[PDB]
C-alpha cells in the first residue's frame, strides 16, 4: 500500500566493518569510524509492483531481457559462480525462474533479476539514488553498535525468525521454517530500529560503490568507495544464505558483482538526500 515509502535515517557516526571478520577474504575488516549525514532510505526493497510502475512509465527493458538470460538458483527450478547457479534463458524480473514462471502471485515480493544499471535507472526515475555501502551498512545496523545483525547478536531473538534466510542443508533441503522458501513480501518480518524491512536476508541489495577489499582505518565522512573498479558492492544476503556456506546476512558482510549481472536472489532499495516529490 505504501511500498515506496522512505524513512529518515538520522545523522550519526558508526563503526563500519568489524575487527572480528567472519569472511576475511571479503574485506570485512578493519573496523573504521564513519560519519553519515542524515538522509532517507526506502523502508522496503523495490517490489515487483513498484518496478512495474517504472517499466509502465518508461518502457525500460532490463539488461537480463536484452541479454536473454539470467542466473537462477537450481533449487527454485520446477560463467556460473557455483554449480547451483544456472544461466536460464528467458529468466528475468517478470519470469524469475524462467519463461514458464510468473510474478502475478507475488506482486509485493522484491523485484529480482535487476542489474546495477537497472537499479540506478529505477532509482533515478523515482527521484532517488542507490545508497552508498556506508549508508547501507549504517542503516542496516539500525542504531546498534558492533552487532552481527540489525537486531542484535542472536539469530532468533526470543525464538522468533527476524529475516528470511535458509534453514536446513544447503542446497538440497530448505525447510522453510521461517515461512518462506524463496523471497518473502518486502514488508515481511520485523523492522529494524530505523524502520527498514528485510535489510538482511530476502534479497541481496545493490549499492553505489565500486568493490575493493582494501580499507583504511581513517575516519571518513559520507564515503563513496573507491573511484574505480570492476564490480559493484552488494549487501545483506538473501533467502539462500546459511551459516554453513554463505554467512552474509550480517550488516558487515559484503559481496560484489559486475554491474551488468543479475540473479534470482538480487534486488535493491533506493535512498535520497531529501524526500522526492510527493
Ligand atoms: C502496468 O500497465 C498495465 C497495462 O496498462 C496495467 O495492466 C492493466 O490495468 C488495467 C487497469 O488499470 C486493466 O483494466 C487492464 O486490463 C490491464 N491490462 C493488461 C494488459 O494487463 C498494470 O496494472 C500496470 N501496473 C502497475 C503496477 O501500475
Ligand atoms: Ca527462508
Ligand atoms: Ca536484504
Ligand atoms: Cu549468503
UniProtKB/Swiss-Prot annotation:
GO CC entries = endoplasmic reticulum; endoplasmic reticulum lumen; membrane
Name used for this protein in its record: Formylglycine-generating enzyme
Task: Relate the outcome reported for changing residue 171 to L.
Answer: In MSD; retains some activity
Concerning its family, UniProt says: Belongs to the sulfatase-modifying factor family.
Q: In which tissues is it expressed?
A: Ubiquitous. Highly expressed in kidney, pancreas and liver. Detected at lower levels in leukocytes, lung, placenta, small intestine, skeletal muscle and heart.
Keywords of this protein's UniProt record, alphabetized? Calcium, Copper, Disease variant, Disulfide bond, Endoplasmic reticulum, Glycoprotein, Ichthyosis, Leukodystrophy, Metachromatic leukodystrophy, Metal-binding, Mucopolysaccharidosis, Oxidoreductase, Signal
Phenotype when changing residue 82 to P: In MSD; loss of activity; decreases its specific enzyme activity to less than 1%; does not affect localization of the protein in the endoplasmic reticulum of MSD fibroblasts; protein stability is almost comparable to wild-type
Q: Where is this region: Interaction with sulfatases?
A: 246-265
What reaction does this enzyme carry out catalytically? L-cysteinyl-[sulfatase] + 2 a thiol + O2 = an organic disulfide + 3-oxo-L-alanyl-[sulfatase] + hydrogen sulfide + H2O + H(+)
Impact of changing residue 238 to T on the protein?
Reduces activity by 99%
> Consequence of mutating residue 241 to R?
In MSD; loss of activity
Q: Name one GO molecular function term.
A: cupric ion binding
Report the function annotation for this chain: Oxidase that catalyzes the conversion of cysteine to 3-oxoalanine on target proteins, using molecular oxygen and an unidentified reducing agent. 3-oxoalanine modification, which is also named formylglycine (fGly), occurs in the maturation of arylsulfatases and some alkaline phosphatases that use the hydrated form of 3-oxoalanine as a catalytic nucleophile. Known substrates include GALNS, ARSA, STS and ARSE.
Report disulfide bridges, numbered on this chain.
123-270, 140-251
What pathway does the UniProt record associate with this protein?
A: Protein modification; sulfatase oxidation
**Record note on cofactor:** The catalytic copper is required to activate oxygen and catalyze oxidative C-H activation.
